[PDB]
Design a binder for this molecule. Structure first.
Ligand SMILES: [Zn+2]
Ligand SMILES: [Zn+2]
Ligand SMILES: [Zn+2]
Lengths: 75, 96, 156, 96, 82
């Protein structure tokens, strides 16, 4: 079989491998909840990129990733 | 997407093909681009004859070996077969 | 345009394009902070439309592309970082040329996001690969090449 | 569809026209008077560049056509030390 | 089913807005009474949805576990941060 003509829809998104900051549940383009009213993005060794303030508070609480069980580190 | 450097004396042809495909259409396309009868072309891979129905991926070169870089030293000859006298490329000058 | 065709340079060779690209460019502590943020994609586009030397180098040899890749906030203002690299490459910057330390902007990217954007925007040329091979092997190229190509070996 | 690139030292290199229009100078040579529209030969005489550098620019033509925008893990193109500074001048002449 | 989840998709969206609103208030004066904060967050989140008293109370407890807010040791009604 073949097709004479086709119609499509496509959801373009930026090519960043990370999607969201899973602390404040805010997209990483915008600012964290601690930071909106007044930031930098901190990556991880386990392909974990979140907000700087959120990561700082989380590591002040515990040295564990918020989704898996692995020791946090900077880049 | 296998790549080949089909050589015959001075003449050299750079050809793209598929991993699993016979040499029949290879001989037909070199016939089309060489403007000569098709039956006299005989491909040599390091100076040995190969089957006319066997796929070229299994012949000794694959897409991992025959890259867009230096593909293969595939020689070609025409029946008058002619002796394989593939002219090598000119030697680079003596650098200081 | 008139200011660009005087080639204004700071102490460290920064042209008028480099400072609009740089993130360390000082913005005054007064009300200028609210409106003037460097890097700015509109200023870079305006300067390139007005004829800024997109391949100009500073004292360290870093071109306009070498400074935008070193930007340390690739995701917070990715809209800014994307458009300036598009403008720099479309204006005719070399996505391969090296500074005084022989460091390609891919090597001086220090950021995955900028590296991905630049690798997307690179256009491959045999002249660039050959000149990179010449520079890497330290081949004596003086008085063996065109004079216009000596510069090309100089930065590639 | 297929163009022929005669080197200085006699060697004839045949690559696709789509592959050989990625260099500006060859595109200019094919256009103009004496385009020789036989649709299969389109010969060009490179009386200056030797055989090895012409072979390398043909490999580069294939390499660029294959990797024009794909395969972000781009393989390195193997410039020998003895072919550089003579492939560089050839690439400048061809405006690759 | 699709209508129900979209009514529940905004439920997670307004919890994130309530947490953002509570933190935004808590970084301007750094301490408020428990009853005084509820009327303040409702006033800010008023052009959008009207938050129920039970939902904001749950958002305080979630933010306590997130260590953005914490009850003061001197007075449990007062809210500090950590
Ligand atoms: Zn966050
Ligand atoms: Zn922040
Ligand atoms: Zn993690």
């Amino acid at each position: 079989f073949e097709v004479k003509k086709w119609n499509a829809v496509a959801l373009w998104a930026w090519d960043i491998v990370v999607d969201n900051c899973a602390i404040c549940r805010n997209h990483i383009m915008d600012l964290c909840i601690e930071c909106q009213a007044n930031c930098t993005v901190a990556w991880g060794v386990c392909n974990h990129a979140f907000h700087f303030h959120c990561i700082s508070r989380w590591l002040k609480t515990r040295q564990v990733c918020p989704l898996d069980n692995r020791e946090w580190e900077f880049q | 997407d296998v790549f080949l450097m089909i050589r015959r004396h001075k003449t050299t042809i750079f050809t793209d093909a598929k991993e699993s495909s016979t040499v029949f259409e290879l001989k037909r396309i070199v016939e089309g681009i060489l403007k000569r009868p098709p039956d006299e072309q005989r491909l040599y891979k390091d100076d040995q004859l190969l089957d006319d129905g066997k796929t070229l991926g299994e012949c000794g070169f694959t897409s991992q070996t025959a890259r867009p870089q230096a593909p293969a030293t595939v020689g070609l000859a025409f029946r008058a077969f002619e002796a394989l006298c593939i002219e090598p490329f000119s030697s680079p000058p003596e650098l200081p | 345009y008139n200011l660009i065709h005087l080639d204004p340079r700071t102490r460290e060779g920064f042209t008028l394009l480099h400072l609009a690209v740089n993130s360390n460019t000082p913005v005054d502590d007064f009300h200028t902070n609210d409106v003037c943020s460097f890097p700015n994609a509109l200023v870079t586009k305006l300067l390139l439309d007005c004829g800024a030397e997109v391949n100009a180098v500073d004292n360290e040899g870093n071109s306009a592309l070498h400074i935008i890749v070193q930007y340390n906030r690739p995701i917070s203002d990715f809209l800014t970082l994307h458009s300036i690299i598009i403008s720099l490459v479309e204006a005719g910057a070399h996505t391969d040329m090296t500074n005084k330390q022989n460091k390609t902007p891919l090597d001086k990217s220090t950021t995955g996001v900028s590296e991905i954007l630049l690798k997307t925007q690179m256009k491959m040329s045999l002249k660039c690969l050959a000149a990179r091979a010449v520079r890497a092997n330290d081949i004596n190229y003086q008085d063996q090449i065109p004079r216009t190509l000596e510069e090309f070996v100089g930065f590639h | 569809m297929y163009v022929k690139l005669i080197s200085s030292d006699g060697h004839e290199f045949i690559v696709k026209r789509e592959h050989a229009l990625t260099s500006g100078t060859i595109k200019a040579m094919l256009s103009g008077p004496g385009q020789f529209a036989e649709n299969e030969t389109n010969e060009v005489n490179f009386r200056e560049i030797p055989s090895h550098v012409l072979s390398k620019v043909c490999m580069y033509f294939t390499y660029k056509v294959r990797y024009t925008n794909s395969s972000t893990e781009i393989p390195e193109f193997p410039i020998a030390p003895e072919i550089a500074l003579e492939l560089l001048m050839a690439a400048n002449f061809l405006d690759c | 089913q699709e209508m129900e989840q979209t009514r529940s998709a905004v439920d997670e969206d307004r919890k994130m807005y309530l947490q953002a609103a509570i933190v935004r208030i808590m970084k301007a004066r750094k301490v408020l009474r428990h009853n005084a904060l509820i009327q303040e967050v409702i006033s800010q989140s008023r052009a959008r949805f009207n938050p129920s008293i039970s939902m904001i109370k749950k958002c305080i407890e979630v933010l306590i576990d997130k260590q953005y807010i914490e009850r003061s040791q001197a007075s449990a009604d007062e809210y500090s941060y950590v």
